Amino acid sequence: PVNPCCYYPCQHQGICVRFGLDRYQCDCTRTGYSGPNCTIPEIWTWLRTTLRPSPSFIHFLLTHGRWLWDFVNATFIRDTLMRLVLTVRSNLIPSPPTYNIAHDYISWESFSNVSYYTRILPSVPRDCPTPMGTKGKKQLPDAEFLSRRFLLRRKFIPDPQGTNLMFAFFAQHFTHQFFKTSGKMGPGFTKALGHGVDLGHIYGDNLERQYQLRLFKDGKLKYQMLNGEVYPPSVEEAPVLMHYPRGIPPQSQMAVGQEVFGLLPGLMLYATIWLREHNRVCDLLKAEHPTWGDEQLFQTARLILIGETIKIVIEEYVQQLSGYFLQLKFDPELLFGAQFQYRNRIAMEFNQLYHWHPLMPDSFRVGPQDYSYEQFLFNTSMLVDYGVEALVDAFSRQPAGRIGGGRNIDHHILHVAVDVIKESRVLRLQPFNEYRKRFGMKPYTSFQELTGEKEMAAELEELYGDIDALEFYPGLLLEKCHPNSIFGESMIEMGAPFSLKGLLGNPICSPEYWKASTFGGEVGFNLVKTATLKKLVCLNTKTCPYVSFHVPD
Amino acid sequence: PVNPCCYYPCQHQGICVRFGLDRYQCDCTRTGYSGPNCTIPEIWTWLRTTLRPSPSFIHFLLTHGRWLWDFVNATFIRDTLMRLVLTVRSNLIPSPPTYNIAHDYISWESFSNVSYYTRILPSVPRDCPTPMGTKGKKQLPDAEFLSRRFLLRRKFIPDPQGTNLMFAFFAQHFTHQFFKTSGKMGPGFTKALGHGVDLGHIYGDNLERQYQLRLFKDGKLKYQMLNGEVYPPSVEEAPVLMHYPRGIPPQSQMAVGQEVFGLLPGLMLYATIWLREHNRVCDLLKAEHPTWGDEQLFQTARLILIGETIKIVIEEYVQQLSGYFLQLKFDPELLFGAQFQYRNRIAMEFNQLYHWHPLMPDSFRVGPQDYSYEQFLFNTSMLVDYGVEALVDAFSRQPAGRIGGGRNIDHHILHVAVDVIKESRVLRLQPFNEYRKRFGMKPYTSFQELTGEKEMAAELEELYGDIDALEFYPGLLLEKCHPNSIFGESMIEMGAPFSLKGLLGNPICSPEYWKASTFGGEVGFNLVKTATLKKLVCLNTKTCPYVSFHVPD
Ligand SMILES: *[C@@H]1O[C@H](CO)[C@@H](O[C@H]2O[C@H](CO)[C@@H](O[C@@H]3O[C@H](CO[C@@H]4O[C@H](CO[C@@H]5O[C@H](CO)[C@@H](O)[C@H](O)[C@@H]5O)[C@@H](O)[C@H](O)[C@@H]4O)[C@@H](O)[C@H](O)[C@@H]3O)[C@H](O)[C@H]2NC(C)=O)[C@H](O)[C@H]1NC(C)=O
Ligand SMILES: *[C@@H]1O[C@H](CO)[C@@H](O[C@H]2O[C@H](CO)[C@@H](O[C@@H]3O[C@H](CO[C@H]4O[C@H](CO[C@H]5O[C@H](CO)[C@@H](O)[C@H](O)[C@@H]5O)[C@@H](O)[C@H](O)[C@@H]4O)[C@@H](O)[C@H](O)[C@@H]3O)[C@H](O)[C@H]2NC(C)=O)[C@H](O)[C@H]1NC(C)=O
Ligand SMILES: *[C@@H]1O[C@H](CO)[C@@H](O[C@@H]2O[C@H](CO)[C@@H](O[C@@H]3O[C@H](CO[C@@H]4O[C@H](CO)[C@@H](O)[C@H](O)[C@@H]4O)[C@@H](O)[C@H](O)[C@@H]3O)[C@H](O)[C@H]2NC(C)=O)[C@H](O)[C@H]1NC(C)=O
Ligand SMILES: *[C@@H]1O[C@H](CO)[C@@H](O[C@@H]2O[C@H](CO)[C@@H](O[C@@H]3O[C@H](CO[C@@H]4O[C@H](CO)[C@@H](O)[C@H](O)[C@@H]4O)[C@@H](O)[C@H](O)[C@@H]3O)[C@H](O)[C@H]2NC(C)=O)[C@H](O)[C@H]1NC(C)=O
Ligand code: HEM
Ligand code: HEM
Ligand SMILES: *[C@@H]1O[C@H](CO)[C@@H](O[C@H]2O[C@H](CO)[C@@H](O)[C@H](O)[C@H]2NC(C)=O)[C@H](O)[C@H]1NC(C)=O
Ligand SMILES: *[C@@H]1O[C@H](CO)[C@@H](O[C@H]2O[C@H](CO)[C@@H](O)[C@H](O)[C@H]2NC(C)=O)[C@H](O)[C@H]1NC(C)=O
Ligand SMILES: CCCCCCCCO[C@@H]1O[C@H](CO)[C@@H](O)[C@H](O)[C@H]1O
Ligand SMILES: CCCCCCCCO[C@@H]1O[C@H](CO)[C@@H](O)[C@H](O)[C@H]1O
Ligand SMILES: CCCCCCCCO[C@@H]1O[C@H](CO)[C@@H](O)[C@H](O)[C@H]1O
Ligand SMILES: CCCCCCCCO[C@@H]1O[C@H](CO)[C@@H](O)[C@H](O)[C@H]1O
Ligand SMILES: CCCCCCCCO[C@@H]1O[C@H](CO)[C@@H](O)[C@H](O)[C@H]1O
Ligand SMILES: CCCCCCCCO[C@@H]1O[C@H](CO)[C@@H](O)[C@H](O)[C@H]1O
Ligand SMILES: CCCCCCCCO[C@@H]1O[C@H](CO)[C@@H](O)[C@H](O)[C@H]1O
Ligand SMILES: CCCCCCCCO[C@@H]1O[C@H](CO)[C@@H](O)[C@H](O)[C@H]1O
Numbered sequence A, B: 001p002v003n004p005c006c007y008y009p010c011q012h013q014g015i016c017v018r019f020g021l022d023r024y025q026c027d028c029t030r031t032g033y034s035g036p037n038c039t040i041p042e043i044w045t046w047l048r049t050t051l052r053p054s055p056s057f058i059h060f061l062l063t064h065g066r067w068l069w070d071f072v073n074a075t076f077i078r079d080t081l082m083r084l085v086l087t088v089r090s091n092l093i094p095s096p097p098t099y100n101i102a103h104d105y106i107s108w109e110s111f112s113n114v115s116y117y118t119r120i121l122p123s124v125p126r127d128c129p130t131p132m133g134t135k136g137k138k139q140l141p142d143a144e145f146l147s148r149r150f151l152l153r154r155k156f157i158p159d160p161q162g163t164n165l166m167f168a169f170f171a172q173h174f175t176h177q178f179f180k181t182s183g184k185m186g187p188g189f190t191k192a193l194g195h196g197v198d199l200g201h202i203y204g205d206n207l208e209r210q211y212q213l214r215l216f217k218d219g220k221l222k223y224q225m226l227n228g229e230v231y232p233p234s235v236e237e238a239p240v241l242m243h244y245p246r247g248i249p250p251q252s253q254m255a256v257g258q259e260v261f262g263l264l265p266g267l268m269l270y271a272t273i274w275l276r277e278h279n280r281v282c283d284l285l286k287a288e289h290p291t292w293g294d295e296q297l298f299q300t301a302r303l304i305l306i307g308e309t310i311k312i313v314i315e316e317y318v319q320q321l322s323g324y325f326l327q328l329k330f331d332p333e334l335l336f337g338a339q340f341q342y343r344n345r346i347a348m349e350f351n352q353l354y355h356w357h358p359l360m361p362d363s364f365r366v367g368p369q370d371y372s373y374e375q376f377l378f379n380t381s382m383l384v385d386y387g388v389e390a391l392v393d394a395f396s397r398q399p400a401g402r403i404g405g406g407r408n409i410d411h412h413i414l415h416v417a418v419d420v421i422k423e424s425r426v427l428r429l430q431p432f433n434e435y436r437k438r439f440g441m442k443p444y445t446s447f448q449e450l451t452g453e454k455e456m457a458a459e460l461e462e463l464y465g466d467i468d469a470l471e472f473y474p475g476l477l478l479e480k481c482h483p484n485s486i487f488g489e490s491m492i493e494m495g496a497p498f499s500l501k502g503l504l505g506n507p508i509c510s511p512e513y514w515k516a517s518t519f520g521g522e523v524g525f526n527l528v529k530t531a532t533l534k535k536l537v538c539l540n541t542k543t544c545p546y547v548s549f550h551v552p553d
């Protein structure tokens, strides 16, 4: 008897439950539909769906008519729309979280064990006829072949939106505080127990590590002086585990919150900027609160930096990424009248979607000098040799690669995409089309509709055999991009919900925490409300270089 | 310079923050008040407080006019009132949680480290003129003296509401799933990381322990047969750490989720009933779902038992406790249209408040036999000797002692109260009157007003010197009791918020989880919806004895 849930019979988030030896029932509770497979719409459900413009038309509206948007952005309409965006996008993510790699049903273990990444759609049943369920071949295309054929970069394709490396390293630094897959436990497990913006990549993901990194004086983080400049301390003064190639002297190993940041100067660059921001904030707090001890100074600075991070990510990072003329706004109060849960659980699908390796260039240009991957990766003297300002200027000037479209991952890191595809199969992620529906989009009827071209589509069709067998990650990177965009609609329609839910679901955005006293008063609250990338760098450097998420003109 | 916040200047939940060397500022954000101390009301705030009837009057309305409540309870008005109770009570509890024993301010560590009990009011600053702030003497009364003088029972005082031992043991059993203070870490720390109704007292507070307790067959829990009846397994069969006096071998110990349950037959009685219920539910689930494996049967049954627990607690436990003519109702759907966070963090004040030792009798009567504490405590055969039905019948017929009013704690366990008072001082809990205000009541102006009498009031007055120096726990237990009630208004006004928040804050009550599929379908969902104390017992025993939370008429 073939497992009926392998046919993915339940639609619109209805829940498929096996009954008896060969039957099944769909739980349509609060889905807005009824019927055996939750396909019969209620009045409002129908109106909403038949009158709702497509993601492509909305994307069009949001990226045209700057004159009208400039007007709108200066009115209450800016808040009305930002609220709509926030609520409509986040409503797609279940909270409290539902499934994980071990349970394809709600359970107390899935709810309480935070070492697990959560998941939005259950896994493909292990007893299905094919790897993807019912469609496709008995064996999926070879991961290595799939990557070399469709993901490997031939000629560098720059992001048409003007995104640069300053943005690419920001994204890598930022996401690594919540994507920390455990090697020991395996796929489906994380070590970033904070499941969000807790800044564990600065303060450490565990208490013992945090303590080794702290100076325990004035609430500050340990540091060292080099060429009269402030940098993270060496592992000798802050005995913390760091992932460095064997043979590298401890004196040349910098100690920071995230163990893998010694991998790239671009990562240590941000680690340095934030470390300096932390100590700088500590100084501001101390002047305002001379009676405070080291602990409160440290904890309050952390909250301020968390706020500064969310602010910059929404108003500058996501702004650059979206390309929207609507001025995004970070304002927790926009949700104080709505039903919203201030909690977040990182999804394995979100982890998959954020592998933006295509952003990395062919080489790294620092002034007249061009540096190869071998001169850049694990280079422990570049940051100190050039200093923060020089690297920020350089990264802000060099363009990053386009993410969507295919064939744009540098050969030096193509192996990551290969492992991502392999991980996807161990996690038994459902097919791309099931995720399209889960996120409110119509499934693609053919590979041609997906890619927008004919040659790659024909080859994919031969390899997968059926569009309904196309996998999650390949689908995301091979989907045709929006006009002049960094990526396709699925990346936005699927990524926006996870991202927004992750940003606003932070406890500091709750009515309980979002108050001046939480940040030490008006001074600290204002630091959060008015934070910018430019201020983050220039208030912590001797000179002010060109700083931005987009290349200059 | 005296610490300005030692005077507890900020009112109505305003937050006191130290500025400069000797100044302070109150953050009145969203309190509904403004001004230096958060005392100037906004028009609506004033309107609401002036029209608000007193807790005494509302208590009067809820305990009179049966004819009217009989009409109300059979209509939608019952639901309207329950929702009001729910939202208004839970709104007094901060969520996300605020402080803990280490931080008297919001911090990321307080939010993320669940080993800490949270707290509603910050601690008494360590640099205050007196132990309670600025009022009272430089030295608090001796804890032992206080207990002997005002808490020690002289003549057993039965609860006037008819509460029995079946209720007392249920309460002790139930609360021990979320109150597990860590001896190793000390005051302020808990081992019950679930912080709520997770049934960890049945399944264990950690995974390793849960695995030792499970049969891994049919989703069931290990068990043993004795005299043809089902009981928890021995430690020899389920090797988990149980706290038994030294010398008692593993084969003679019973292994259950909570390590301290071997202490009393009353606790193991409930451990036995719930274990039978778990396995009984597994049977019903397997009949409906023959394809389900052991893990899903186990997890689903746990969710059902959690649901049955909350149902019984709200509609029978709290109902008995309140004495309201209003028929309380457990219906998560009542909050779906409101703003509510589905999370809970156990407060140290709630732990203190729940020390209901006065409930325990002078001796334990089982039919013709009367057992002393010496014969009852640590008795390893009584449960099996009498069987479940017999003990339930016996406990359901024996009256429990009155909680409030004072002088009603059996000398055998008075030492617990002494330690609660000592613990309170290590935690530096603010005075009783500060808590009265935090929970919407007027502070008491004298001990006479507090106790309602003159003898104890005069002595307390001399020991403490000032009503504003009275401590939390002593205050709760010495407050005058409502007419014919089990305890005073403070117990209700402070206890209800914590209780209701903890019950409805459970994720199974969220819109995401409260669906039939979560419980395996309609059969499991109805088990939750129609759960009853009588059914919990009678469907798991050979015969059906007298079972209730109140003695028979
Ligand atoms: C979050 O969730 C993850 C995933 O579940 C947790 O992972 C870890 O915990 C699991 C449970 O501890 C680990 O499971 C392994 O199970 C192996 C098999 O053991 C079996 O169970 C008992 C073993 O006990 C037996 O009897 C005596 C009794 O004392 C015992 O001393 C003796 O050793 C004997 O084996 C038995 O019934 C069976 O026959 C099996 O032996 C273990 O051998 C192994 O050590 C481990 O416990 C799992 O591997 C862990 N890691 C991962 C990645 O899964 C994680 O702990 C959870 N986190 C939290 C905070 O809950
Ligand atoms: C939830 O919250 C609780 C409460 O904070 C927390 O408690 C435990 O964790 C902390 C931190 O691990 C424990 O700290 C204890 O105090 C001392 C700290 O002082 C010393 O620490 C270092 C000593 O060892 C190191 O010294 C050399 C330097 O010469 C260094 O090179 C080596 O690395 C070496 O290991 C040192 O840096 C410093 O100078 C001091 O000597 C700890 O050392 C000690 O081990 C203690 O552990 C608490 O005691 C823990 N329990 C309690 C009750 O506080 C929980 O861990 C937390 N839970 C979670 C999940 O976060
Ligand atoms: C970690 O990063 C540091 C950078 O801080 C690396 O050190 C730097 O390495 C560069 C390249 O080896 C050094 O180059 C300098 O400038 C010229 C560059 O070459 C010139 O341009 C092209 C290239 O051949 C030709 O057309 C020109 O004729 C000319 O050759 C070089 O010739 C100079 O000799 C000089 O070295 C740079 O000086 C150096 N910086 C410092 C402070 O050492 C470092 O190698 C890297 N570590 C590792 C292990 O890769
Ligand atoms: C754990 O609990 C069990 C009960 O489940 C304890 O065992 C039981 O102990 C009682 C008394 O200790 C035994 O009593 C039986 O019946 C009479 C009762 O006494 C009578 O009533 C009064 C009392 O003096 C007098 O007026 C009468 O003359 C008469 O004495 C007793 O006399 C009998 O000898 C008989 O023991 C009961 O039988 C026993 N149950 C079993 C099956 O063992 C057990 O002690 C306890 N463990 C500990 C450590 O206390
Ligand atoms: C040239 C620079 C880069 C190098 C050397 C690099 C490297 C790596 C390696 C070695 C891994 C782990 C692979 C495995 O376990 O198989 C990884 C993972 C990952 N990378 Fe990159 N990467 C780069 C850039 C970036 C960028 C710019 C982003 C975009 C935000 C990013 C995102 C991620 C994510 C989300 C993961 C998974 C983390 C996890 O599960 O722990 N990377 N990368
Ligand atoms: C036969 C009677 C009982 C005995 C022997 C007993 C005993 C004890 C002991 C020995 C402690 C721990 C004290 C310490 O660490 O200093 C404790 C705690 C506790 N007891 Fe009782 N008790 C009884 C009844 C009850 C009842 C009826 C309730 C009410 C629901 C209750 C509730 C509590 C609570 C809430 C704690 C604190 C738990 C914690 O923080 O871990 N007890 N008791
Ligand atoms: C509900 O979903 C099922 C599952 O795909 C649909 O398919 C079933 O019913 C068909 C109608 O006759 C049969 O032809 C299929 O063999 C049968 N498949 C399975 C797995 O049982 C079903 O038609 C859908 N019903 C509705 C109303 O949409
Ligand atoms: C605000 O609260 C403070 C603290 O309770 C009040 O007390 C301060 O001001 C009084 C005015 O005469 C003095 O008598 C007190 O000594 C002084 N105490 C402190 C904290 O320094 C204050 O009156 C209140 N003010 C308002 C506006 O209500
Ligand atoms: C009510 C006024 C409607 C005007 C119709 C505007 C037409 C915009 O049309 C849009 O063009 C895009 C490409 O430029 C496509 O990607 C979108 O799918 C399409 O809807
Ligand atoms: C309330 C929010 C309204 C957002 C609507 C913005 C959409 C801008 O729409 C623009 O209108 C222009 C009309 O002169 C056209 O010429 C542009 O092609 C079109 O994209
Ligand atoms: C927070 C929910 C508010 C519902 C009010 C109805 C207003 C409908 O609002 C619509 O929602 C769509 C998404 O479903 C958007 O794509 C449309 O642009 C928006 O106008
Ligand atoms: C014209 C301006 C419109 C502003 C509203 C945009 C925000 C609504 O965004 C909508 O979110 C939904 C759920 O994730 C998606 O299914 C829709 O395709 C998307 O347009
Ligand atoms: C029509 C509305 C009338 C509002 C009158 C406001 C009454 C509250 O008045 C306030 O009472 C506090 C406590 O006694 C004082 O500390 C404040 O200074 C006082 O303004
Ligand atoms: C009996 C009259 C009651 C009036 C209710 C006051 C409503 C709140 O009024 C507010 O007062 C603030 C302080 O001056 C102003 O800054 C705000 O603009 C104003 O809206
Ligand atoms: C909608 C909620 C209404 C709550 C009101 C219930 C209060 C019952 O009130 C009772 O009414 C009786 C009338 O016969 C009086 O005799 C009692 O003294 C009075 O306490
Ligand atoms: C007549 C029936 C009334 C039902 C409403 C009772 C529920 C509201 O209860 C109220 O909760 C507040 C916050 O905890 C307390 O401050 C009030 O004193 C209390 O009466």
Ligand SMILES: C[C@H](C(=O)O)c1ccc(-c2ccccc2)cc1
Binding pocket: A085, A089, A318, A321, A322, A328, A491, A492, A494, A495, A496, A497, A499, A500
């Ligand atoms: C505002 C806009 C929307 O809601 O449309 C939006 C929000 C978030 C992202 C995002 C961020 C990170 C990864 C992937 C996607 C993209 C667009």
Ligand SMILES: C[C@H](C(=O)O)c1ccc(-c2ccccc2)cc1
Binding pocket: B085, B089, B318, B321, B322, B328, B491, B492, B495, B496, B497, B499, B500
């Ligand atoms: C419904 C009623 C109300 O909200 O009035 C209520 C709710 C809860 C308790 C309670 C529970 C445990 C300890 C202490 C108190 C008491 C009364």
